[PDB]
């Protein structure tokens, strides 16, 4: 059934100019990562080589090589968010979940994003497609509460 979805995706991006990125985006959105089982057909459709595809996949960060937990937590580690106390937040959260930075699981996945546009609302995060700001050491409780 995966092949069907993939074919659909490829058909949807037919004739476009430089359609590798969109196609990969969609492939990821579908499954959750770029399986090596799907490096070839992409190439076959686009006239590329498995290698080029894998290289593109490897370069960019937003293309998962392996799936994530049921929940995902991106936590800015940039300048501004650092300024208004991101370290402490990070510590509290990774103590709560027991998962350090970059370390994933079947349950959750904590990672970094390096900005979100919430540079005034300095301590910022993205939890499961929901943005959060002004993350003091209290809101983390609510963050974890809705998130086991």
């Amino acid at each position: 059934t995966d092949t069907a979805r993939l074919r659909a995706i490829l058909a949807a991006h037919r004739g476009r100019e430089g359609a590798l990125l969109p196609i990969l985006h969609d492939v990821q959105a579908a499954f959750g990562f770029i399986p090596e089982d799907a490096y070839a057909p992409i190439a076959a459709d686009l006239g590329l080589t498995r290698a080029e595809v894998a290289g593109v996949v490897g370069f960019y960060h937003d293309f998962r090589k392996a799936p994530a937990g049921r929940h995902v937590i991106k936590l800015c580690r940039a300048e501004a968010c650092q300024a208004m106390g991101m370290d402490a937040v990070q510590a509290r959260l990774e103590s709560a979940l027991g998962l350090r930075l970059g370390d994933s699981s079947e349950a959750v996945t904590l990672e970094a994003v390096y900005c979100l546009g919430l540079c005034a609302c300095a301590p910022a995060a993205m939890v499961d497609d929901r943005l959060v700001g002004r993350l003091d050491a209290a809101a983390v409780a609510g963050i974890v509460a809705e998130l086991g």
């Binding site: 686009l46 370069f59 293309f63």
Partner: protein, 493 residues
């Protein structure tokens, strides 16, 4: 009574949606009109969940509205604790020239009616009557600038592209502000999207293109959605110009902010920076001539050509002309955005305008530009904003980013984070950013230990990175370091 609850990420983050819920709840419990709008951000983030209510006098703004404070409404708008009065009368707003962001936070972004009533689609409808060359010279007269970098006259670029033969030219907007403190683009494409559509349409009519692209990051999803809706809504207004624009999402790579890497990423390839024997203007996207620009540079185009170049030529300094937005974030009381003419000091912008710090502590550092920018201390408060003086006074002003750090900061940690960034964000094409970075991050540790065979080593490294590196990310990276070291020696043993 009319309600204007922001739809910006700066609002949804702080719980604007919860406020929406609470309002609707109360109205359901307390029979009322309950007329809600979903405008963008005015630019004052310290109270972003602001519930602007209509009155014959104007629009009265409220503070950082929490859902628990909503009950305070529907009873008395005068005796409210978080009552601000006319939002337009706030000194943080009054002192702004505010040209480019003029119609940002006072309209529903996806409302063509309001946009049109807000002088919308004027420049576009004006340009088509003009010629491809007249418009170009109009844009050139102002000599607007490069906003996302050092600053190159866009007019010259347009000219170069126009004077270059091919079946299909291209136009690209590089909204990939992966920088810190830089969030103006987000506000502009989340609120007042149509200006971008307009500017690109104009620029495409001008240059001689039909196909256009816009590069959004993946860390700006709501903005992506908005721009998609915009491009999808303005199809009638777009066909008039013979212009078809598309959005392209990035994939989490800072370096893709560079023009070459950007258009390499558009092409379906991996974002490795190209050397510059040929320029993208000559040979860019798919070997074709392409005009690549920042959002702010394309947001001024319509306003320019419409309201007259000479007017735009009025604001600013001798070299730097026109208004600029100053984004102010980090540890700072009144953050957000401040659009004004150049010549203003960061002294004023950081101590007078934006108060002080959230923690109440003093400021030890102020980082203009992104992490490719220096750490100016308080002593540099006598330093007005402009490309020239800041480039000459050992620094940088690009997207006018501005963060703040108080006395509880460790410059060592930051200087380290700089190289750590240049390390994690790196195409991996040239050696001085591949290795130089991940080595500097060890050198700084050695310094933290106390070694003395490191500082000169560090300096030499910084120097070779400056002079040798291909892009800026490994050429500007040294500035943070050297700045933190020469300005704040009391933290580097």
């Amino acid at each position: 009574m009319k309600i204007w609850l922001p739809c910006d990420a700066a609002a949804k983050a702080c719980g604007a949606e919860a406020v929406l819920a609470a309002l609707r709840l109360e109205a359901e419990k307390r029979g009322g009109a309950l007329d809600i709008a979903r405008n963008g951000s005015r630019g004052m983030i310290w109270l972003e969940p602001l519930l602007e209510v209509e009155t014959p006098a104007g629009r009265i703004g409220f503070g950082p509205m929490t859902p628990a404070d909503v009950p305070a409404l529907f009873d008395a708008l005068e005796s409210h604790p978080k009552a601000l009065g006319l939002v337009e009368e706030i000194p943080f707003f009054k002192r702004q020239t505010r040209l480019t962001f003029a119609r940002c936070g006072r309209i529903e972004p996806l409302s063509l009616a309001q946009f049109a009533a807000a002088e919308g689609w004027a420049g576009l409808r004006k340009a088509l009557k003009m010629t491809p060359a007249e418009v170009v010279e109009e844009v050139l007269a102002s000599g607007l600038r490069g906003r996302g970098g050092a600053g190159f006259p866009t007019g010259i670029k347009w000219r170069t592209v126009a004077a270059a033969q091919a079946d299909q030219k291209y136009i690209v907007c590089n909204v990939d502000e992966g920088d810190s403190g830089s969030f103006a683009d987000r506000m502009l494409i989340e609120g007042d999207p149509f200006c971008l559509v307009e500017g690109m349409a104009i620029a495409g009519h001008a240059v001689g293109a039909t196909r256009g692209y816009v590069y959004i990051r993946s860390e700006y999803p709501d903005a992506i959605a908005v721009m998609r809706a915009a491009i999808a809504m303005a199809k009638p207004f777009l066909a008039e110009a013979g212009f078809e624009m598309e959005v392209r999402v990035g994939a989490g790579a800072y370096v893709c902010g560079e023009e070459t890497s950007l258009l390499n990423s558009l092409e379906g390839k991996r974002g490795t920076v190209r050397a510059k024997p040929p320029l993208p203007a000559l040979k860019g996207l798919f070997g074709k001539p392409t005009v690549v620009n920042n959002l702010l540079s394309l947001a001024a185009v319509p306003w320019i050509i419409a309201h007259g170049a000479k007017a735009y030529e009025s604001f600013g300094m001798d070299r730097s002309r026109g208004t600029i937005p100053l984004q102010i974030g980090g540890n700072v009381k009144r953050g957000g955005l401040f659009e004004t003419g150049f010549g203003i000091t960061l002294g004023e912008l950081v101590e007078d305008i934006c108060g002080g710090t959230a923690s109440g502590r003093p400021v030890k550092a102020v980082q203009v530009g992104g992490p490719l920018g220096a750490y100016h201390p308080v002593s540099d408060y006598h330093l007005p904003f402009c490309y020239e003086q800041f480039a000459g006074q050992g620094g940088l002003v690009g997207h006018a980013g501005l963060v703040v750090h108080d006395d509880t900061a460790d410059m060592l940690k930051l200087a380290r984070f700089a190289m750590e960034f240049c390390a994690i964000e790196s195409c991996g094409t040239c050696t001085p950013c591949r290795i130089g970075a991940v080595r500097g991050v060890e050198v700084i540790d050695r310094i933290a230990a106390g070694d003395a065979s490191a500082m000169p080593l560090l300096d030499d490294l910084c120097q070779t990175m400056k002079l040798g590196s291909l892009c800026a990310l490994g050429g500007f990276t040294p500035y943070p370091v050297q700045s933190a070291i020469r300005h704040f020696p009391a933290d580097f043993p």
